[PDB]
Amino acid sequence: VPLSRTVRCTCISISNQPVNPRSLEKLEIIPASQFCPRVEIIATMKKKGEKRCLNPESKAIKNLLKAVSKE
Amino acid sequence: VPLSRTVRCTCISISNQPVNPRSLEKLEIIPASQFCPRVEIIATMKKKGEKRCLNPESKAIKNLLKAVSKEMSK
């Protein structure tokens, strides 16, 4: 049985690389919980099974949320 | 390489009602594509992990997205 506090976390590292909105299949936002002490953001790209953990702290990411949510 | 996939929007119905960010377990934003002409937002609620589609066009959801974007930065 895993330590419950972080059982759910799925990101181990982050990418500060600009994500091209037109390259996103979808964006997942996972608010912190009693199973993962931090907010995790995962972008699923359209090409070659790529996915990536994004910096929820960053603002460029916040502009991504707005874009992805509007178009 | 692309996998076989759904070629239509995935939401049966979409909710216009306000949502308390606290009750959200997860949120996924799916941008419009040639498979579904509009953005879809699938919420996974903490209760029974019920999957509920949110209407990104509704004021309530636009508000939820804003509360989320804020309560996401120190």
Coordinates of C-alpha atoms in Angstrom, one line a residue:
Chain A
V1 CA 0.0 0.0 0.0
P2 CA 1.4 3.4 -1.2
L3 CA 1.9 6.4 1.1
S4 CA -1.5 8.0 0.6
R5 CA -0.4 11.7 0.6
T6 CA 1.1 11.5 -2.9
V7 CA -0.4 8.3 -4.4
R8 CA -2.2 10.4 -7.0
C9 CA 0.6 12.7 -8.2
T10 CA 1.6 11.9 -11.8
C11 CA 4.2 14.6 -12.7
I12 CA 7.8 14.4 -11.6
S13 CA 9.1 17.2 -13.8
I14 CA 7.9 20.3 -15.7
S15 CA 8.4 21.9 -19.1
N16 CA 8.6 25.7 -19.4
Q17 CA 8.5 25.4 -23.2
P18 CA 5.8 27.4 -24.9
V19 CA 2.9 25.1 -25.8
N20 CA 1.4 25.8 -29.2
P21 CA -2.4 25.8 -28.6
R22 CA -3.1 24.4 -32.0
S23 CA -1.0 21.4 -31.1
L24 CA -3.2 20.4 -28.1
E25 CA -5.6 17.5 -28.2
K26 CA -6.5 18.5 -24.6
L27 CA -5.4 20.0 -21.4
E28 CA -6.0 18.4 -18.0
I29 CA -6.0 20.4 -14.8
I30 CA -5.7 18.5 -11.6
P31 CA -6.1 20.7 -8.5
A32 CA -4.1 19.8 -5.4
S33 CA -5.7 17.2 -3.0
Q34 CA -5.1 15.0 0.0
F35 CA -3.6 12.6 -2.5
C36 CA -1.3 15.1 -4.2
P37 CA -0.1 18.3 -2.5
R38 CA 0.2 20.2 -5.7
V39 CA -1.7 21.3 -8.8
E40 CA -0.7 19.3 -11.9
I41 CA -1.3 20.4 -15.5
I42 CA -1.0 17.9 -18.3
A43 CA -1.1 18.8 -22.0
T44 CA -1.8 16.0 -24.4
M45 CA -0.3 16.8 -27.8
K46 CA -1.8 15.6 -31.1
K47 CA 1.4 14.1 -32.4
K48 CA 3.4 11.0 -31.5
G49 CA 1.8 10.1 -28.1
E50 CA 3.4 13.2 -26.5
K51 CA 2.1 14.6 -23.3
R52 CA 3.6 17.0 -20.9
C53 CA 3.4 18.4 -17.4
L54 CA 3.1 22.1 -17.5
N55 CA 4.0 24.7 -14.8
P56 CA 0.8 25.7 -13.1
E57 CA 2.8 28.6 -11.6
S58 CA 3.8 30.0 -15.0
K59 CA 1.6 32.7 -16.5
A60 CA 2.2 31.6 -20.1
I61 CA 0.2 28.6 -19.0
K62 CA -2.6 30.7 -17.7
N63 CA -2.8 32.3 -21.1
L64 CA -3.0 28.8 -22.5
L65 CA -6.0 28.0 -20.3
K66 CA -7.8 31.0 -21.5
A67 CA -7.0 30.3 -25.2
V68 CA -7.8 26.6 -25.0
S69 CA -11.1 27.4 -23.2
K70 CA -12.2 30.1 -25.7
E71 CA -11.5 28.6 -29.1
Chain B
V1 CA 0.9 7.7 -35.4
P2 CA -2.8 8.4 -34.7
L3 CA -5.0 5.9 -32.9
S4 CA -8.5 5.1 -34.0
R5 CA -10.8 7.5 -32.3
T6 CA -14.3 9.0 -31.7
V7 CA -15.3 11.1 -34.6
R8 CA -18.0 13.2 -32.8
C9 CA -18.3 15.3 -29.7
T10 CA -18.2 13.2 -26.6
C11 CA -20.8 15.1 -24.5
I12 CA -24.3 13.7 -24.3
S13 CA -25.4 16.9 -22.5
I14 CA -23.6 19.9 -21.0
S15 CA -24.3 21.7 -17.8
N16 CA -24.7 25.5 -17.5
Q17 CA -24.8 25.4 -13.6
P18 CA -22.2 27.0 -11.4
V19 CA -19.5 24.8 -9.8
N20 CA -17.6 25.0 -6.6
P21 CA -13.9 24.6 -7.6
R22 CA -13.4 22.8 -4.3
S23 CA -15.6 19.9 -5.4
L24 CA -13.6 19.4 -8.6
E25 CA -11.3 16.4 -8.7
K26 CA -10.2 17.2 -12.3
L27 CA -10.9 19.3 -15.3
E28 CA -10.1 18.6 -19.0
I29 CA -10.5 21.2 -21.7
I30 CA -10.8 19.8 -25.2
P31 CA -10.5 22.4 -28.0
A32 CA -12.7 22.3 -31.0
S33 CA -11.4 20.0 -33.8
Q34 CA -12.7 18.4 -37.0
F35 CA -14.1 15.7 -34.8
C36 CA -16.2 18.1 -32.7
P37 CA -16.8 21.7 -33.7
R38 CA -16.8 23.1 -30.2
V39 CA -14.7 23.0 -27.1
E40 CA -15.8 20.5 -24.5
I41 CA -14.9 20.6 -20.8
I42 CA -15.2 17.4 -18.8
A43 CA -15.2 17.7 -15.1
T44 CA -14.5 14.8 -12.8
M45 CA -16.2 15.5 -9.5
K46 CA -14.8 14.2 -6.2
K47 CA -18.1 12.5 -5.4
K48 CA -18.2 9.1 -7.1
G49 CA -15.8 10.7 -9.5
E50 CA -18.9 11.6 -11.6
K51 CA -17.9 12.9 -15.1
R52 CA -19.9 16.0 -15.9
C53 CA -19.6 18.1 -19.1
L54 CA -19.5 21.9 -18.5
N55 CA -20.7 24.5 -21.0
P56 CA -17.7 26.8 -21.7
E57 CA -20.2 29.2 -23.2
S58 CA -22.1 29.6 -19.9
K59 CA -21.3 32.4 -17.5
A60 CA -21.0 29.9 -14.6
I61 CA -18.3 27.8 -16.3
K62 CA -16.5 30.9 -17.5
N63 CA -16.4 31.9 -13.9
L64 CA -15.2 28.5 -12.7
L65 CA -12.4 28.6 -15.2
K66 CA -11.4 32.0 -13.8
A67 CA -11.5 30.8 -10.2
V68 CA -9.4 27.9 -11.2
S69 CA -6.8 29.9 -13.1
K70 CA -6.4 32.2 -10.0
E71 CA -6.4 29.6 -7.3
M72 CA -3.6 27.9 -9.2
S73 CA -0.9 30.5 -8.6
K74 CA 0.7 31.4 -5.2

